Design a protein around this ligand. Structure first.
Ligand code: 5HG
Ligand code: 5HG
Ligand code: 5HG
Ligand code: 5HG
Ligand code: MG
Ligand code: MG
Ligand code: MG
Ligand code: MG
Lengths: 209, 209, 209, 209
């Protein structure tokens, strides 16, 4: 790359044509709507969980992605490594707003199912989710060639789904639900970063933290 | 204002919650829709006309805004000083797009009316608007015998109005047309700059030039 | 281009490695330095003069760049079309600061020399430059294959030179002077926009207006 | 905080007056310079270590900062919780660059000292630092028998110190070393984010990851 690439003011001002929204704008768009089911992706949507994925990679498959298909990894990831996962502020704000609305709150994750899991407790605890709004996390798993989330959004009648991945947005689209994008943080170990806004979907401002 | 204020990455990544759109997105939204009337504000929407307004302020009221109520100024402004106005590329793109659709093109200005005007010719020439799509500039306002921007949009069944000022957006909203915002350039002499998107309207990307 | 290109937060936060400065920072870096000669480029540095260049193009060579070698154009451009040129705020601030310092102020322009010129008066007037700091504009002209400015920076012992063009910065470099970049506005008819910072030079923040 | 705040192009193009640099620019500045001692702060400079700090706050002082004065926390933090810390790519690039130069690599941390520490191994492993360039982590501070970050930089003749906090920059400045700033990530639990560039120091581009 050039040592001194420079810039110009067209470039400095240039905006991607993205429908950006705030939590306040979402809440307003739902004003007077009665309680409904809504859902959240977990990783890079409500939890910065890269710490535990990074430990798993290093412990179980330093050269490859094999750790993500290792049951010994998932058993660690789902039963205590989320103690090191950093809650996202956008998620605190979204979840408070949905509890305010009286909405049923679901978490739908591509993480693999394990014998036991403490993830539901970590989420209920960290985000102050009352018993009545909280539901046990759905571990839909990862199966290339299939969006494992879509069936679950349909089964739970989820009408809004938040996620950082293209699969989160298209799971919502698959069922006619409203898909809303959260920015994956740039220090996530899950790379490349997705193209937020790539489906014409809403993207929440400042949602990387 | 510290000499060395510094910054941080939250501020660097910070986005206003704005519904940004492109010309391509607007065109996409109109696919299959029959020819219709569309409208443009003039100043800082299709022409950077500050050069003529700057000269008029210096010439007719260097220490006030009285030049804007001075018939002598308007006669100059509407009969040749737009030879120094700079066409905005966002407008070239939109007018080409609407002409290709077979839309009727209208211009609705709050400039004071004059005995003669050469602004219609300047616009048809600069923007290569065919005679069949072109319409004489409409001078809207609140002087006796005039109609407001709103009433003209209603009269001409204008379905989409493009403008840089709050009043262009509200004019369209008042009659249920689609108000679409264009950025006023930072070097405009019409200050302060409006808050594009202040009504949750669509704002065109990169529309300051 | 894709209809919905999207973005990510690495891209949103990404900064070119540019030495950005404020007028306050420049003034501080010169604190206690005795009066010296400094110089300014005119076009897109102190004056948004695109109005007159745009009129010249349209009047004299709508299909080409031939107007810039037409003496009939320069005679118009240098004797009254700068009445439509919009002073830049960065230049008001820079020039006030240099007058404060007791600096000798020069304007060095690639515009062609004419029989008479009112540009010096326009500049002295618009920027409130006292007789003692003001010097007549130097019309160095345009001669491909030669930086016509460098000899003049040498002759006048100019120690700091402000400009939007690569030739302004390298004229300063040619003579060991401090070259400082001003952003060309995105609505200028002089395109493409230069790569500000391309020589490792300082670039003044917000200098497009 | 309006629901729909909008924006304008002055704000969109606005740049803080910061001396931004790249790794390539830093390396260029060191061309021909013999091997030397360089230094790195640890937390939010070379490691995103918030995961361990977040767990310690929840574990040892959920409602205060007392965990930072709790020997039990530090013993955990310095003896394994950095397996969940995420290496910053800006640090990989700088350490590789300095190692290739044959520079001595130092780490100077304000973390509390412990009986044993495994952080040196974590850093040498994660960053592939050869034994000949690696040095045991230095724990600096103001406890009896300790020396400050400044005194250690002086002691080890560290010529360049990289850090995210104000105190890293001032430490280097105090002894006449080159203080270079790295952006603290927005999802760090160490808040508020510092104003990188607050002392007119160089700030590395894109250094939040
Ligand atoms: N490196 C990672 N950091 C955080 N989360 C991760 C990482 N790698 C994989 N994941 C999980 C992504 O979620 C799977 P889903 O999108 O199907 O729910
Ligand atoms: N500086 C200016 N002050 C007031 N009006 C101005 C100025 N520059 C241009 N204009 C015209 C704005 O258009 C009026 P409209 O928005 O009613 O069409
Ligand atoms: N379109 C233009 N707008 C403003 N200034 C212009 C334009 N075209 C040419 N110029 C003059 C550029 O200055 C020549 P210099 O950089 O040698 O001083
Ligand atoms: N949340 C935190 N509060 C205080 N210190 C913290 C926190 N997270 C990480 N750290 C360590 C910062 O390093 C201390 P140093 O800058 O003296 O090396
Ligand atoms: Mg995810
Ligand atoms: Mg207007
Ligand atoms: Mg110039
Ligand atoms: Mg630190």
């Amino acid at each position: 790359s050039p040592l001194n690439p420079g810039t110009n003011v067209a470039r400095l001002a240039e905006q991607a044509p993205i429908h950006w929204v705030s939590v306040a704008q979402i809440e307003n768009s739902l004003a007077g709507r009665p309680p409904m089911a809504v859902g959240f992706d977990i990783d890079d949507t409500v939890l910065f969980s890269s710490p535990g994925f990074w430990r798993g990679k290093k412990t179980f498959s330093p050269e490859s992605e094999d750790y993500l298909k290792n049951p010994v990894f998932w058993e660690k990831m789902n039963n205590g490594w989320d103690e090191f996962s950093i809650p996202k502020e956008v998620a605190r704000q979204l979840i408070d707003m949905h509890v305010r609305r009286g909405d049923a709150i679901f978490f739908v994750t591509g993480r693999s199912p394990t014998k036991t899991e403490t993830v539901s407790k970590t989420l209920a605890d960290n985000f102050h989710i009352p018993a009545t709004n909280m539901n046990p996390v759905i571990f839909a798993g990862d199966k290339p060639g299939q969006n494992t989330k879509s069936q679950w959004l349909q089964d739970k009648n989820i009408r809004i789904f938040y996620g950082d991945s293209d699969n989160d947005i298209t799971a919502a689209r698959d069922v006619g639900a409203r898909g809303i994008r959260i920015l994956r943080a740039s220090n996530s170990t899950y790379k490349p970063l997705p193209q937020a806004g790539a489906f014409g979907e809403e993207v929440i401002v400042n949602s990387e933290y």
